[PDB]
Amino acid sequence: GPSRVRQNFHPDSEAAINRQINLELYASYVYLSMAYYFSRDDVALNNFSRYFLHQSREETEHAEKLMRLQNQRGGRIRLQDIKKPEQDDWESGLHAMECALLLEKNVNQSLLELHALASDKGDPHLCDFLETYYLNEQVKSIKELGDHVHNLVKMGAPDAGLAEYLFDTHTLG
């Protein structure tokens, strides 16, 4: 139009927010796939399942907050296909946690690139939005996944017969 609300909002920032929306929806789908891997009759780790389902729902919330930001700033949401995850068979609790840690680091890198663009375009509202709602949640998530990977490795996952079971019951319980 531009939108009657738009102010100090660069087209490059608008496009980068649309890309980030797709990545958060993609993360949601990866964790959904993982959740239902853990409720297979030949995996049957119900607390891993609940853990990943909760992560999936959180990613959807992250996507929605960016969609709200796009509207608040007068940008226009442009959705793209949500790619299927890389695996349906996630192999083990340890492997899923390692894949989740890598996914979170990848999403972090995208958010840091977004913040660098917002800085370059002199958009302190957008910088503040990312800092307030994204950057510290991402650091907490990466640390939690790092902790879970460490314990599973030390316990002897995936081959040690008791390791994933005991982690499921105690840590994720």
Residues 11-70 that bind a second copy (CB under 8 A): 29, 33, 36-37, 39-44, 67-68, 70
CB of 45 closer than 8 Å to CB of 91: no
Query: Rounded distance, CA 168 to CA 151, Å?
Result: 11
Q: Which residue is nearest to Fe ion (CB)?
A: 62
- Binding-residue pattern over the window 105 to 124 for a second copy, x denoting contact by CB under 8 A: x--xx--x--xx--x--x-x
The count of chain residues that interact with Fe ion, using the rule CB under 5 A, is: 7
Query: Is residue 155 a contact residue for Cl ion (CB under 5 A)?
Result: no
Query: Is residue 9 a contact residue for Cl ion (CB under 5 A)?
Result: yes
**Which H or E element spans position 24?**
helix 11-37
Feature table: binding site for Fe cation: 24, 59, 62, 104, 138
CB of 146 closer than 8 Å to CB of 101: yes
Min dist CB 27 to Cl ion, Å, is 20
62 interacts with, out of Fe ion, Cl ion, Mg ion, none, CB within 5 to 8 A per kind: Fe ion
Query: Rounded distance, CA 48 to CA 37, Å?
Result: 9
Query: Is residue 54 a contact residue for Cl ion (CB under 5 A)?
Result: no
Query: Rounded distance, CA 130 to CA 135, Å?
Result: 6
115 interacts with, out of Cl ion, a second copy, Fe ion, none, CB within 5 to 8 A per kind: a second copy
Phi, psi of 121 (to 5 degrees): -90, 10
With tokens 């139009």, the residue in question is 1
Phi, psi of 150 (to 5 degrees): -55, -50
Among 16, 27, 100, 127, binds a second copy (CB under 8 A): 127
**Which H or E element spans position 123?**
none
Among 62, 148, 157, 172, binds Cl ion (CB under 5 A): 148
Among 65, 151, 155, 165, binds Cl ion (CB under 5 A): 151
